[PDB]
Each structure stands twice: as structure tokens, then as C-alpha cells.
């Protein structure tokens, strides 16, 4: 089977928050081995609570663990911006197998808008001899963490060779992403202009670059 947890939980900056993790006598109920992880977009999970209530080193004392019956609970007090993430519970069973929580999208609410700062890179002379032409559009310091990109071969828009990373929570908790328009060196040499245009909560940001 699987561990049941709420889908979404939202909190105001400073408040305490509780994420439950419902299980059975075969996991949460009969064992002291429930652990909590946090997913930040471009990050690998980080253990905040292990064996019900134990915090590892470098994890804030604002995190606490608990269990009653078949229900485990993670308590984040004094909510801050970095706390906005995806939370998951894990438990060791009667056997060697392990069970996983459905996950919980924890949202903080102070959340000031921050339009992205766009930086458009032409392909490097180093990459050019390598027979590739990837234009890199570095979208940074944006909030909330979502954008719609749009490339153009001067004015004529392009939908081919477009790749867009998922936003990754930076150290200041704002998001940063990257869009790649992969072209051939003749393709690049030809067009007199290229444009990168992100759209974020209606407001659009546009950078331009031209070959030399
Ligand atoms: C997890 O199971 C708990 C029981 O421990 C459920 O919590 C109860 O839910 C109802 C309505 O949904 C409330 O009015 C009660 O006060 C809760 N009871 C207790 C004893 O705390 C809960 O619905 C389950 N949820 C998930 C997401 O797994």
C-alpha cells in the first residue's frame, strides 16, 4: 500500500503548520521509523525529521516530528519563504520494504511579485567550432515560479528546437530557469535577429541579440 497525506496546505509568514501522514499498524502504527523530506524544484530531497521526531544537523529547530496511532505529523513553526516546497513522509515497515506519502504542496503567503530579469546569450565561438548554436536565455529572480517562454527568428516566431528548464528555487527563494533554442551554425549565421520573450503574470520581458 501507500501513506495518505493532504494534497495542499497554505500558511501565513510566522504561523505553525501541520502535515499529517496516515498509515497502518504495519508502518506508522507499530514502528518508530517515519521520516520527512522536502523537495525544492531543482533540488534533491532533504531529510528534516527522521525516526518520528529527530532532526539531523543543519536542519532548523522550527521543524518537529510526532506520531499518534497510525498518524505521523510534521510541524513547521515560524514559517519563512524557504519553507515553500513539496513535503513527503517515508516509513520503514514490518519487513524490509518502505512506504511513501502522496505528498503535500506547502505554500507560504507573504509572496511579493518579482518579474524575471532576462539575459540572452548568443552561442560561444568555442561551441561554434563544435558545430552547434544554442542560444541561452537565463530567466532569473522571479516569483511566483512560473513563466511562458517565446522565441522568434527576428519577427517570424519559432516552435522548433525549443527547450525550457523547470524553475529552480535560488538561495533568495526566487526562481531561476533557462530556455535553450538549439540551432545549426548556418541557421544562426543566417537570421539578422533573435528574441527571447518570457511572459510572467501578464507582464512580458524581451531580450535581443544579433550575429557578428
Ligand atoms: C487522516 O486520518 C485522520 C484520522 O486520524 C482524519 O482526520 C479526521 O478528519 C475529519 C474530517 O476529514 C475531522 O473533522 C477530524 O477532527 C479528524 N480526526 C482526528 C481524530 O484528528 C483525516 O481525514 C485523514 N487525512 C488524510 C489526508 O490522510
Residue 67, φ and ψ in degrees, nearest 5: -155, 140
Q: Is the CB of 22 under 6 A from ligand 1?
A: yes
Buried b (16+ CB within 10 A) or exposed e, 118-135: bebebbeeeeeeeeebbb
Tell me the C-alpha distance between 200 and 1, whole Å. 40
Burial of 48 (0-12, 13-18, 19+ CB in 10 A): buried
The DSSP H or E segment spanning 188 is helix 185-190
The answer to whether 85 touches 100, Cβ cutoff 8 Å, is: no
144: preceding bond cis by omega (within 30 degrees): yes
Atom of ligand 1 nearest to the CA of 6: 27
| Distance, CA of 148 to CA of 146 (rounded, Å) | 7
Residue 157 domain boundaries: 111-210
30 shares its domain with 78? yes
Q: How far is the CA of 24 from the centre of ligand 1 (A)?
A: 14
Burial (CB count within 10 angstroms: exposed 0-12, middle 13-18, buried 19+), residue 96: exposed
Q: Helix (H, G, I), strand (E, B), or coil: what is residue 31?
A: coil
Strand pairing class (71-76; 63-68):
antiparallel
* Angle formed at CA 17 by CA 56 and CA 31, multiple of 5 degrees: 50
Shared domain for 97 and 34, answered yes or no, is: yes
Same domain, 85 and 106: yes
Closest Cα to residue 106, out of 12, 201, 200? 12
Do 121 and 76 belong together in one domain? no
Residues 202 and 121: their CA atoms lie apart, in Å, by: 24
Element (H, E) at 38: strand 35-39
Q: Is residue 147 within 8 Å of residue 200, measured between CB atoms?
A: yes
Residue 47 CA, ligand 1 centroid: distance in Å: 25
End-to-end CA, the chain: 60
Round to whole Å and give the CA distance between 148 and 134: 19
Task: Evaluate: CB of 18 within 6 angstroms of ligand 1.
Answer: no
Structure-solving method: X-ray
CA distance 211 to 192: 7
Q: Do 57 and 122 sit in the same domain of this protein?
A: no
User: What is the pairing mode between strands 8-11 and 104-108?
Assistant: parallel
Q: Is 166 exposed, middle or buried (0-12, 13-18, 19+ CB in 10 A)?
A: exposed
DSSP-based helix, strand, coil % in the chain, nearest 5: 5, 50, 45
Q: Which atom of ligand 1 is nearest to the CA of 69?
A: 5
- Decide the pairing of beta strands 162-164 and 156-158: unpaired
Among 60, 88, 110, where does a domain finish? 110
* DSSP result, 45-90: -EEEEBTTTBPPTTS-TTEEEEEETTEEEEEE-S--GGG-EEEEEE
Pocket perturbation via mutation, ligand 1, pick of 8, 71, 102 by most ligand atoms within 8 A of CB? 71
Q: Distance between CA 196 and CA 204 in Å, rounded?
A: 10
Ligand 1 contacts CB of residue 104 (under 6 A): no
Both 115 and 99 in a single domain?
A: no
Instruction: Give resolution, Å, one decimal.
Output: 3.0
Same domain, 84 and 117: no
Of the candidates 16, 47, 18, which has an alpha carbon nearest to the alpha carbon of residue 33?
Answer: 47
Spatial distance between the Cα atoms of 189 and 203, rounded to a whole number of angstroms: 31
How far is it, in rounded angstroms, from Cα 121 to Cα 183? 13
Read off the CATH number of the domain in which 106 is found.
2.60.40.10
Burial of 77 (0-12, 13-18, 19+ CB in 10 A): middle
Cβ neighbour number for residue 138 with a 10 Å cutoff? 17
Amino acid at each position: 500500500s501507500a501513506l495518505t497525506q493532504p494534497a495542499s496546505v497554505s500558511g501565513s509568514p510566522g504561523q505553525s503548520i501541520t502535515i499529517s501522514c496516515n498509515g497502518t499498524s504495519n508502518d506508522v502504527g507499530g514502528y518508530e521509523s517515519v521520516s520527512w523530506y522536502q523537495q525544492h524544484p531543482g533540488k534533491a530531497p532533504k531529510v528534516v525529521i527522521y525516526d518520528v521526531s529527530k532532526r539531523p544537523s543543519g536542519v532548523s529547530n522550527r521543524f518537529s516530528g510526532s506520531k499518534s496511532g497510525n498518524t505521523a505529523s510534521l510541524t513547521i513553526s515560524g514559517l519563512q519563504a524557504e519553507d515553500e516546497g513539496d513535503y513527503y513522509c517515508k516509513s520503514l515497515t514490518s519487513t524490509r520494504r518502505r512506504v511513501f506519502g502522496t505528498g503535500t504542496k506547502l505554500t507560504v503567503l507573504g509572496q511579493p511579485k518579482a518579474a524575471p530579469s532576462v539575459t540572452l546569450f548568443p552561442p560561444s565561438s568555442e561551441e561554434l567550432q563544435a558545430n552547434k548554436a544554442t542560444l541561452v536565455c537565463l530567466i532569473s529572480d522571479f516569483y511566483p515560479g512560473a513563466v511562458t517562454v517565446a522565441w522568434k527568428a527576428d519577427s517570424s516566431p519559432v516552435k522548433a528546437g525549443v527547450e525550457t528548464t523547470t524553475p529552480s528555487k535560488q538561495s533568495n527563494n526566487k526562481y531561476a530557469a533557462s530556455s535553450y533554442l538549439s540551432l545549426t551554425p548556418e541557421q544562426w549565421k543566417s537570421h539578422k535577429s533573435y528574441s527571447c520573450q518570457v511572459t510572467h503574470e501578464g507582464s512580458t520581458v524581451e531580450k535581443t541579440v544579433a550575429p557578428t
